[model samples]
Target: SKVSVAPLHLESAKEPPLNTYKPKEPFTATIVSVESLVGPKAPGETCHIVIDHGGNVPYWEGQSYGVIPPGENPKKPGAPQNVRLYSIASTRYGDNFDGRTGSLCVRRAVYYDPETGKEDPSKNGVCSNFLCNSKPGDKIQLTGPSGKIMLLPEEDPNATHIMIATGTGVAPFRGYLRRMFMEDVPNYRFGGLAWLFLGVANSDSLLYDEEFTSYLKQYPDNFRYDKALSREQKNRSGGKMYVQDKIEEYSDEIFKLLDGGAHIYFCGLKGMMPGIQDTLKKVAERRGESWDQKLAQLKKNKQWHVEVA
Candidate 1:
């Protein structure tokens, strides 16, 4: 193998299960605040939502919370609303790092007609719309802080991370960054490079723009990111920019990172993974190598983590 794989330290399957609060018995959390990440001028909407559980619902970063809307599930025909999971955007200490509040990055889900290129008012996400329209101090029903796949390696502070995200997929990476850069968490001092490749439709849909850019400025050596805006940016081939394009442009560096035992995370739509993998395969081909074995080794070493919606 061209890559020297790391030992399986934080294997996802081996991690003990979370004794989560289930839908049958959900937590009644209050909304602390709902602040817009992007302006109203954008077609899509995103927000930073703070959920106050009064220190009751303890959760780790990279986990997800199930939000049950206040109404019945019309799709299910007379049952409690189905749970919609949102990735946790804050670290274990929560947004305030006080353990009382957790934050979520919510993008109001709206669809458009491909033919007409017009908004389809009838097709919308229930939980997402409910969340984006929520006010401070609003009480809501929420379920467990589940998931272990995308867990940041708090035990490996020096381990490098190559984060790849699209749209609201930046949620977990946000938590990962906060833990590595802002929190005074014990047994943690990140000394490795953390690179983020984010894909979005345009600049207006870039979530946490202020925080991410500021992190780059503050930790120039440790943290860096690349944005691929499909609508506004162009690739080397003069095509619409995508995360895969960013991956290809930096394939050499990414290959180096993987070979150096860096962890890689992919979060977003399932559709994004195929192109990313194909790009990796192409990169491997250029070096007279194969990606299958390398990718398998990454999975075996617990270095490749993915969580998609």
Candidate 2:
């Protein structure tokens, strides 16, 4: 473990709208484009979609948008539905940082019968199915730009950001990376290391492959990408590799980061945290420190954050 470094002040803090639009009066956004992020023949479907907000609605990175699927339940008196939140995948200024557009990374939620091992199309997820099958000309009603839980510490240029995510959880990290590497946003330049540890089933399932790899080539020292492929890779014990395995492999550096007052973010399934904590505990034992104490302090300083679903 290392000593904590004092926070350095940057330029300005952005105050993104909490609920710029409400469900009753939502923003009408048009789908501009949609592309499959995974391979064409992959088992699951994930899409990278762009929406044109007509230059009205704006958002910040790490925020989410609420989409109300276009349908009413016929189960009873056809009651109104709740909005399903999707993580924003573009920079605060949008894909081009042009303020007119935003992007989302969504996985079509299809359920399979365990007995038959077949997808039941009729029972597919409401919002996911709607968004996946939507066309470029289609329009959607959505609310939010809500949630301040997973925001990047952009005000501290010298603070490290350790992002650990799996599956669609990689969405907010994409926004953070775009802001750090792609755009020259005023008062929001990053100087410290930003590391991402992404877990997926296989190489074909990696999202934003081109953009992440592009960042690697462009910002060698400032960015690092580590991946754990459960289907295509193995741990030292010869079992299937997972995100926690990657954390153990890099425990030394991670503990060092935490000791130095780095901001850590974790997203994805709730189950992943235990193994991550176990690995960190082992690292702490080796360093003659307490991970529990460190984590408590980290939480106190708001240096650790999570959004597991």
Candidate 3:
């Protein structure tokens, strides 16, 4: 008996009236004092940002800020603009992280162009342009300390720390470092066993080299910094790679950090996380763990988190 099922009727799935996901409640902050966060190595690769917005918004270190993008410049009426996100490099215990008139370590990013009207790099992005050109007293809008994927230590009597980062993604870890060392959060010890895995295409692309180095130097017995300079180093892991490659290269140490109770916080380019996830998945598989199952475990255990603009 040939049962002819009339071409399966398909119904377009429409969103239900009730919403399951909700956006984070927005917060407002103003420009405190914008400054550079560069040392000898990352000289020109810097960002200019204002940390405080003249109000009290209590957030832990390793948080982020959103620059509400403005529209096209009336002056350069033909250009386009977009918003951006920057991580708070200062810790809650730091002066800049104070409630009012704080500071941000931002490297002003500039874009150049050849065509006069066709491409005015000056009008490239609203937030970038405003921040790069704004006066010291200017005001910038912000919202969110969103996401629960922040630094979480192990419940063990003593837990070690392993931080992995690249470019701006390093922002959050900077805060964690400040907390562990700068503020010395009680009951939560993160040094003497903290390991940092850092990679950058341009050695100069890495920010806050001095501060990091100083942290290591000051806490020589506690801090360890491993760097991957793909652009400058000829024998880098992936040839012409980004961060995930370096992490994969050190899969043993990376996973060991996880096994020893180190939380992973991935930030920076939105494009980078997927690759990092894939790499972590393979690393898990290599360790005889289910990729999906481990990822679920990470979320269920709240071991992984992400932040992007």
Best by lDDT: 1
Worst 10 residues of 1 by lDDT: 1-10
Local distance difference test, per candidate? 0.83, 0.82, 0.57
Q: What is the C-alpha RMSD of each candidate to the true structure, in Å?
A: 6.3, 5.6, 14.3
Clashing pairs in 2: none
1 against 3, candidate with superior TM-score: 1
Better structure of 1 and 2 per lDDT: 1
Q: Candidate 1: misplaced stretches above 4 Å?
A: 1-19, 75-77, 113-122
Q: Which candidate number has the best TM-score? A: 2
* Global fold similarity of model 3 (TM-score): 0.70
Q: Taking the tens digit of each residue's C-alpha lDDT, what string does model 2 give over 107-205?
A: 999999989988877788989888888889899887887988987776688789999998899999998888777776555668789999999889888
> Could you estimate the TM-score for every candidate?
0.90, 0.91, 0.70
**Candidate 3 at 251: error in angstroms?**
2.2
Query: Any runs in candidate 2 off by more than 4 Å, and if so which?
Result: 1-14, 74-76
Regions of model 3 farther than 4 Å from truth: 1-32, 38-45, 69-85, 96-123, 142-145, 151-157, 184-192, 234-238, 281-290
Model 1 per-residue lDDT tens digits across residues 96-196: 65667888899888887888978756588888989989999898898887888988886677889999999889999998898778766545678888998
Weakest lDDT window of 10 consecutive positions for candidate 3: 2-11
Give me the displacement of residue 21 in model 3, in angstroms: 21
